[PDB]
């Protein structure tokens, strides 16, 4: 794999991300000042857990679909066998959503984008799982401190998906090749942008999978 192929891969992954990100960074930052009022927060708190689940499950399910589309546009992903495509998405898609979420999170006031405005974690009180929700907020908070660029997110989330250690894979070696090239791309790009320093601050790969255990519970 030459320098030309590696930079092509970087640009390609970043393009796919751009086309499948759902919420434009520009929009999210501008909307940071648009914050749910205390009356609105109360309105969300009064809703049933069933309604809040319906709303959240709809928005996240949609977010999952954008991640599937991202995967489809990654060089080599569609060339993998049926079984491996599904195994990877099943294991990684929700982890990618979680990472993508840090973009929609404002660390100055500890709020997240939801249904047109920014609200804190108390917005989700009717769900009755303050632990899971605080941990999601903590995770987005610790990722926000890194100032993840759009392209770092693209490359990093490509690696969250293209993991050759997912159990159930048939063509393990073809997934390794793809992972290897994406790692070269990620590392090359951190080099060129002087952002090597973030490597040692990214959350461990089993730490993403430990928040999705209790998600599925």
Residues 6+ apart with CB under 8 A from 139: 98, 102, 203, 211
Report the candidate in 85, 88, 94, 102 with the shortest Cα–Cα distance to residue 67.
94
- The footprint of ligand HQ7 on residues 81-110 (CB under 6 A) is 97, 100-101, 104
Minimum distance of ligand HQ7 from residue 171's CB (angstroms): 29
> Residue 23 CB, nearest distance to ligand HQ7 (Å)?
6
Q: Is there a contact between 128 and 63 (Cβ–Cβ < 8 Å)? A: no
Q: Minimum distance from CB of 24 to ligand HQ7 (Å)? A: 12
Rounded distance between C-alpha atoms, residue 101 and residue 172, angstroms: 29
Residue of the chain from 17, 124, 148, 156 that contacts ligand HQ7 (CB under 6 A)? 124
Residue 48 found at the interface with ligand HQ7 (CB under 6 A):
no
The span of 84-92, 113-121, 158-166, 188-196 binding ligand HQ7 (CB under 6 A) equals: 113-121
DSSP secondary structure letter of residue 195: -
Calpha distance 175→173 (Å, rounded):
5
DSSP sequence for 129-171: -HHHHHHHHHHHHHHHTTT--HHHHHHHHHHHH--TTSTT-SS
Shortest Å distance, C-beta 190 to ligand HQ7: 23
Q: Both tokens of residue 56?
A: 């959240």
Q: Which of 25, 35, 56, 198 binds ligand HQ7 (CB under 6 A)?
A: 56
Residue 59 contacts ligand HQ7 per CB under 6 A: yes
In whole angstroms, what is the distance from residue 5 CA to residue 35 CA? 44
Nearer of residues 59 and 165 to ligand HQ7, judged by Cβ: 59
Q: Name which of 40 and 114 has its Cβ closer to ligand HQ7.
A: 114
- Mask: binding to ligand HQ7, 6-45, rule CB under 6 A, as x and -? -----------------x----------------------
Which residues form the interface with ligand HQ7 (CB under 6 A)?
23, 56, 59-60, 63, 97, 100-101, 104, 112-116, 124, 133, 136
């Amino acid at each position: 794999a030459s320098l030309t192929e590696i930079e092509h891969l970087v640009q390609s992954v970043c393009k796919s991300y751009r086309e499948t990100c759902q919420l434009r960074l520009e929009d999210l930052l501008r909307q940071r000042s648009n914050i749910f009022s205390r009356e609105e927060v109360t309105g969300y708190q009064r809703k049933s857990m069933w309604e809040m689940w319906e709303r959240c499950a709809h928005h996240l399910t949609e977010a999952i679909q954008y991640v599937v589309e991202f995967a489809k546009r990654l060089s080599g992903f569609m060339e993998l066998c049926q079984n491996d495509q599904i195994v990877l998405l099943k294991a990684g898609a929700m982890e990618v959503v979680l990472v993508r979420m840090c973009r929609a999170y404002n660390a100055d006031n500890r709020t997240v984008f939801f249904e047109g405005k920014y609200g804190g974690m108390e917005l989700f009180r009717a769900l009755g799982c303050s632990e899971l929700i605080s941990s999601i907020f903590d995770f987005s908070h610790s990722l926000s401190a890194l100032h993840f660029s759009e392209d770092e997110i693209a490359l990093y989330t490509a690696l969250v998906l293209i993991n050759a250690h997912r159990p159930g894979l048939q063509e393990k070696r073809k997934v390794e090749q793809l992972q290897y090239n994406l790692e070269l791309a990620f590392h090359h790009h951190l080099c060129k942008t002087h952002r090597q320093s973030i490597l040692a601050k990214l959350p461990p790969k089993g730490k993403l999978r430990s928040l999705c255990s209790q998600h599925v519970e």
